[PDB]
Design a protein around this ligand. Sequence first.
Ligand SMILES: C[S@@+](CC[C@H](N)C(=O)[O-])C[C@H]1O[C@@H](n2cnc3c(N)ncnc32)[C@H](O)[C@@H]1O
Length: 252
Amino acid sequence: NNEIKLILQQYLEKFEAHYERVLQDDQYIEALETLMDDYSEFILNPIYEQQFNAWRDVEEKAQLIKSLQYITAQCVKQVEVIRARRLLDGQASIEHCIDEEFGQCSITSNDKLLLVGSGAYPMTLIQVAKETGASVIGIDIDPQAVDLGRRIVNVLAPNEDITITDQKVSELKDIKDVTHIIFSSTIPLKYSILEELYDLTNENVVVAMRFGDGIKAIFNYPSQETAEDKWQCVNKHMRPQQIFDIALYKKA
Ligand SMILES: C[S@@+](CC[C@H](N)C(=O)[O-])C[C@H]1O[C@@H](n2cnc3c(N)ncnc32)[C@H](O)[C@@H]1O
């Protein structure tokens, strides 16, 4: 208990200070990015993983995890907003292909991908459009993220077929044409949206759900059990030096 709980509380306090500073002045982004790198290195260190796993508290552990995953999700968003505003303020124009996340279920230019939680700095959305030539829809509930994302796409990828909207999945007119769906990891509602998508989507749709379980759940929303007759987990992609893992879902 004692050891890992103390560090996790200290990270929560550090994230509070860094996040509050960045809200007042975006010059403190570099310090927050460094904290996020240190946090990542902590999460992926087998020593801390073992300590975390050994802490068999139920209530306090669960709550502390939930406090961290919420504030660090806000930090991820704030980094994206600042990076986006910097690119647009200028008015000027890596290690893994997103296609890799779908294993055998490959993406061609004839396919159509929905990315849930596109974000203000939608590099992943642009990446997959450029790599695959597929049509791409990104949704984000935050209109700041919709505006920044839309205008970044128009600068960096004007020739790709990319739509960004605040529409919920039940409001997407072309939902039945979607062949591939990716969920960003830092979406609290991702499993409720997954369940809603069952009835909305065609029968052969494939979903890549990004998540973090165990110690990775302090920087990600975790996996959940799905309704067993609806979404079947056909593949789990878990790696020790990846800050998020991927669960592939198909119908029945
Ligand atoms: C950090 S950002 C961008 C994606 C991020 N890079 C990731 O991979 O987790 C996460 C985005 O998801 C958005 N978001 C959160 N909940 C959502 C929901 N229920 N539906 C759509 N977008 C959501 C946030 O507004 C935010 O812009």
